[PDB]
Ligand binder design. Structure first.
Ligand SMILES: [Mg+2]
Ligand SMILES: [Mg+2]
Length: 754
DNA sequence: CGATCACG
DNA sequence: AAGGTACGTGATCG
């Protein structure tokens, strides 16, 4: 009746209850369902076996687990009818307890759909789609500033400012006197945290926007709330924000709301060497943002001087986080709806996992038994499966062309699907060029069928946009057709994704083989037009007209795409991505370009990370600037020769030689003792409370042996007594950072010293 | 070398 | 207050 924003489950008297969080004509509504039961499927060697199989037992929470009910069902598997048994369980946590007991059984051929989280199982099976309708959501951006000193335990320093922003403006809560109109002064860290809780409960936002709140703002708020003995009842059910382990990093959920962390979103959507809020804001809104570094914040807080500067930075962090959230949420909301899963989960997923959620829902709709995810063995074998070289030098006036909108059409016309591949007793088939894979034409494949529907749906949205005089629906429909384009263009890549259920190596190669015929046509037609192709990948190409005027290159390129699209049948489409003033290419997905506005765009080259020393990062940025901004590779080579000589002669300040690496576990848990851990053990031995989250700063000293034995804690480094390892900083830091870039110009590691 | 570890 | 724990690249260890 309203708009679904999330779904989860609660346990009551040992039984699961599904919770559906809704927004209905401006109001928060929570619907409960007690009737949905967890299940798996089992393919048996013979029907007789069910009598033995239904009697399988497990143990969970001290008590035994049973198969509640069994049901024989007819489904489709590998494009063939299949008879399997639906095995019902009492609680979803029963599934991981009993699934291997069922799989182990001598009469069970295989088990299926045994790793689908219960709340997602519910949404699929009940045919429920989140984010449908015109329902208007409310938003709040939240940020925090902490007092930090070098290499402190996560949460030792207090939170000193909390900022938030809305359409009503950006505000700061602090516990020191600062005279600014947007600053609220409270008495303590405890009262500042309680004020944020009060702001969230009163504003009752549907969406809480953060910039990396999954790993910084919420874990820190929770750590300080713990130390202070106070609760954070931010959930609409008064629950505290909940930390979820996603990879090695975290994910924070706020119940009844959408915690929208922009950090994974922006990282997926745009290409930047660093994802600082300042770099991101400038990239999206073309406006500069000032950074106030942690050491400046500590100095201002401790001295009590220059606090206005810190409060302005805190306020801007919230204000720009609000603006970025409003910019990036509409597309995440349309992707959620398209795949039929909540924004929380979708905003945190790869495109491959978006495809899998879309396929799982469509598989239920079409009574198609879903394949299983590969085991560790199969996953590694897929990674091991096997399926031009760029022009050297510095090129000017580079035009970029995108091929990606070609592949969905190839999958559909050739019926490329795992269920149509090398079918026995097939009457008509398509044979892939060179590779020779045969795709049955007798029935539309599961994937080609879905893709066709997706593409038809996009054409209908586009037709509705041309015929619409309402700018509000035109905006919404624009996000919708874009969301379809993103999902449709992810299928080619998905066929080759090693963790995919509907993984198909032969599908991916066949699509590559058929796609190549069009790529060779584009290449030939460009070359006859005077263009030189500098780089080609399955995704696109880069070309120039050697020694031509920039507007002439653009005009001819724009005319070229207009022409090719008129020659290519159907929905096969070439796209002019952009233009670059300069660029160079090293190998596949290793290149660097500069646009006409001076913005450097690189792929697979930059080392902007804390585990690389400043000297290596500084040298790399300088080499890229000499090449792209100055068009001078000889300047770049001289930069490297000068830096290495300076390292040899001990002319580089020790602060530019520090390496930072986080401690992620108790020190005794390490299998390999890397330099940061060798340093950490020595600190612990000295009485330092070494805990996970600590970031270890070290300098590699001159000497015999591996680097771990020669690493020193930065706080212990004495320039008089210690001598850094110049050979380590030259060969393991500086030269690796620049050798890949310079290789594009004919230099070897050996050519970059005197 | 393969295993282990960390970055964003 | 559930809920399977990404992914891909590169460096140093053992
Ligand atoms: Mg959830
Ligand atoms: Mg901040």
């Amino acid at each position: 009746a309203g708009m679904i924003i999330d779904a989860d489950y609660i346990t009551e008297d040992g039984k699961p209850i599904i919770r559906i969080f809704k927004k209905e004509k401006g109001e928060f509504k929570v619907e409960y369902d007690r009737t949905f039961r967890p299940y798996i499927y089992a393919l048996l060697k013979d029907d007789s076996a069910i009598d033995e199989v239904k009697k399988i037992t497990a143990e969970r929470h001290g008590k035994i687990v049973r198969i509640t009910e069994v049901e024989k069902v007819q489904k489709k598997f590998l494009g063939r009818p299949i008879e399997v048994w639906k095995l019902y369980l009492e609680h979803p946590q029963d599934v991981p307890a009993i699934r291997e007991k069922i799989r182990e059984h001598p009469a069970v051929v295989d088990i299926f759909e045994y790793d689908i989280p219960f709340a997602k199982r519910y949404l699929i099976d009940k045919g429920l789609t989140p984010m449908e309708g015109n329902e208007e959501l409310t938003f709040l951006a939240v940020d925090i500033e902490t007092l930090y000193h070098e290499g402190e335990e996560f949460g030792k320093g207090p939170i000193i400012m909390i900022s938030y922003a809305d359409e009503e403006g950006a505000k700061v809560i602090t516990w020191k006197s600062i005279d600014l109109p947007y600053v609220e002064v409270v008495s303590s860290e405890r009262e500042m945290i309680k004020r944020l809780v009060k702001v969230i409960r009163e504003k009752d936002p549907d969406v809480i926007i953060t910039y990396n709140g999954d790993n910084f703002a919420f874990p820190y708020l929770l750590k300080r709330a713990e130390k202070l003995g106070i609760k954070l009842p931010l959930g609409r059910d008064n629950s505290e924000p909940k930390m979820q382990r996603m990879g090695d990093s975290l994910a924070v959920e706020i119940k009844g709301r959408i915690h929208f962390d922009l950090f994974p979103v922006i990282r997926r959507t745009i290409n930047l060497p660093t994802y600082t809020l300042e770099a991101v804001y400038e990239a999206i809104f073309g406006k500069s943002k000032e950074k106030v570094y942690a050491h400046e914040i500590a100095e201002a807080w401790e001295t009590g001087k220059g606090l206005e500067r810190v409060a302005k930075y805190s306020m801007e962090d919230a204000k720009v986080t609000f603006e970025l959230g409003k910019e990036f949420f509409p597309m995440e909301a349309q992707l959620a709806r398209l795949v039929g899963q909540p924004v929380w989960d979708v905003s945190r997923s790869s495109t491959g996992n978006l495809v899998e959620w879309f396929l799982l829902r469509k598989a239920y709709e079409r009574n198609e038994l879903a394949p299983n995810k590969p085991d560790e063995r199969e996953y590694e074998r897929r990674l091991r499966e096997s399926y031009k070289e760029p022009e050297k030098g510095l090129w000017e006036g580079i035009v970029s062309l995108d091929f990606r909108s070609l592949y969905p059409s190839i999958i559909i016309t050739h019926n490329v699907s795992p269920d149509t591949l090398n079918r026995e007793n097939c009457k008509e088939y398509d044979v892939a060029p060179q590779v020779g894979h045969r795709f049955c034409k007798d029935f539309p494949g599961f994937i080609p069928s879905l893709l066709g529907n997706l593409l038809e749906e996009r054409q209908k949205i586009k037709k509705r946009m041309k015929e619409s005089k309402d700018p509000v629906e035109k905006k919404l429909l624009d996000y919708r057709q874009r969301a379809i384009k993103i999902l449709a263009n992810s299928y080619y890549g998905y066929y080759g994704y090693a963790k995919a259920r509907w993984y198909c190596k032969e599908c991916a190669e066949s699509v590559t083989a058929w796609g190549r015929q069009y790529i060779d046509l584009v290449r030939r037609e460009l070359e006859s037009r005077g263009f030189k192709v500098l780089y080609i990948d399955t995704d696109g190409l880069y070309a120039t007209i050697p020694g031509a005027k920039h507007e002439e290159i653009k005009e001819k390129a724009l005319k070229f795409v207009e022409y090719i699209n008129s020659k290519l049948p159907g929905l096969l489409e070439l796209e002019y991505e952009g233009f670059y003033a300069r660029g160079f290419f090293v190998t596949k997905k290793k290149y660097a370009l500069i646009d006409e506005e001076g913005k450097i765009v690189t792929r697979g080259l930059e080392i902007v990370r804390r585990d690389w020393s400043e000297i290596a990062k500084e040298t790399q940025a300088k080499v890229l600037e000499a090449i792209l901004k100055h068009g001078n590779v000889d300047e770049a080579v001289k930069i490297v020769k000068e830096v290495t000589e300076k390292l040899s002669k001990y002319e580089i300040p020790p602060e530019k030689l520090v390496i930072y690496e986080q401690i992620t576990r108790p020190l005794s848990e390490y299998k390999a003792i890397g330099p940061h851990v060798a340093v950490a053990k020595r600190l612990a031995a000295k009485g330092v409370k070494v805990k996970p989250g600590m970031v270890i700063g070290y300098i590699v000293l001159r000497g015999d042996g591996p680097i771990s034995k020669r690493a020193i804690a930065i706080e212990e480094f004495d320039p008089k007594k210690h001598k850094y390892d110049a050979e380590y900083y030259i060969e393991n830091q500086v030269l690796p950072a620049v050798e890949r870039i310079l290789r594009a110009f004919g230099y070897r590691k050996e050519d970059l010293k005197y």
